[PDB]
Ligand binder design. Structure first.
Ligand SMILES: OC[C@H]1O[C@H](O[C@H]2[C@H](O)[C@@H](O)[C@@H](O[C@H]3[C@H](O)[C@@H](O)[C@@H](O[C@H]4[C@H](O)[C@@H](O)[C@@H](O)O[C@@H]4CO)O[C@@H]3CO)O[C@@H]2CO)[C@H](O)[C@@H](O)[C@@H]1O
Ligand SMILES: OC[C@H]1O[C@H](O[C@H]2[C@H](O)[C@@H](O)[C@@H](O[C@H]3[C@H](O)[C@@H](O)[C@@H](O[C@H]4[C@H](O)[C@@H](O)[C@@H](O)O[C@@H]4CO)O[C@@H]3CO)O[C@@H]2CO)[C@H](O)[C@@H](O)[C@@H]1O
Lengths: 102, 103
């Protein structure tokens, strides 16, 4: 009844203040998104544990600065989800979203 | 012409740059055994090497290695495609894709 997405984010400039995640359901339903904040950190960068109150197989994600001051990769990207859980790694300026730790 | 210059930018998310260097070998138009090249500089993205080879090359191989082959950062051979004897690339720890503009 929920989808949990752990998002790892690394910026080579070390300047994470204000960066947050705009995530929206896409399948099996499309709905307007919400902003999610980073909740922790590890050796790769910031960590967000995102909980969405539906079972989802795909979401959209944009890494954004404050309220749309900038987009780190300014196009919609997607995360494929199995059994209500995914974990991804995202790097500043790199379009590809990784499903294993670099 | 008669030399090839490759500027190689390297970023590690863990900051553990100590010992890392570049193994580069000519591949086209003629293949030869490689050589190690050290980083000489640094910028906001991380380490920088300027690699000069005394031939006009359209393709080189590259491996990012720790000292004398103690480890590789991405273990498979990778290649850089070069036009008119000059190229510049950006390499990220653990990321296979070599980038041709700054992330
Ligand atoms: O089912 C809901 C909708 O879902 C999908 O919409 C996505 C977009 O595709 C994403 O790009 C994003 O939209 C962001 C947008 O990227 C961002 O620039 C900002 O856009 C605002 C803008 O700041 C504002 O000034 C105003 O002019 O409107 C803009 C909207 O374009 O904020 C957007 C979020 O509000 O996320 C949405 C989902 O939230 C889907 O593709 C749509 O078909 C669908 O309606
Ligand atoms: O002359 C053209 C040759 O070019 C190509 O050879 C390449 C390889 O494909 C690359 O992988 C690399 O080789 C490295 C190798 O990756 C690395 O592991 C290391 O291997 C050592 C090892 O540490 C050591 O313990 C012992 O086993 O010796 C090994 C080498 O036999 O070092 C290699 C380089 O010395 O670079 C070369 C070019 O230098 C092409 O594939 C060949 O067919 C071609 O002959």
């Amino acid at each position: 009844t929920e989808t949990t997405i752990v998002v790892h984010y690394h910026r080579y400039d070390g300047k994470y203040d204000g960066w947050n995640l705009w995530i929206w359901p896409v399948e099996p339903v499309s709905q307007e998104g919400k902003a999610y904040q980073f909740t922790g950190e590890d050796d790769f960068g910031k960590v967000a544990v995102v909980k969405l109150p539906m079972d989802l197989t795909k979401v959209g994600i944009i890494v954004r600065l404050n309220e749309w001051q900038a987009k780190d990769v300014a196009k919609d990207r997607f995360i494929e989800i199995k059994d209500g859980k995914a974990e991804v790694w995202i790097l500043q300026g790199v379009e590809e979203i990784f499903y294993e730790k670099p």
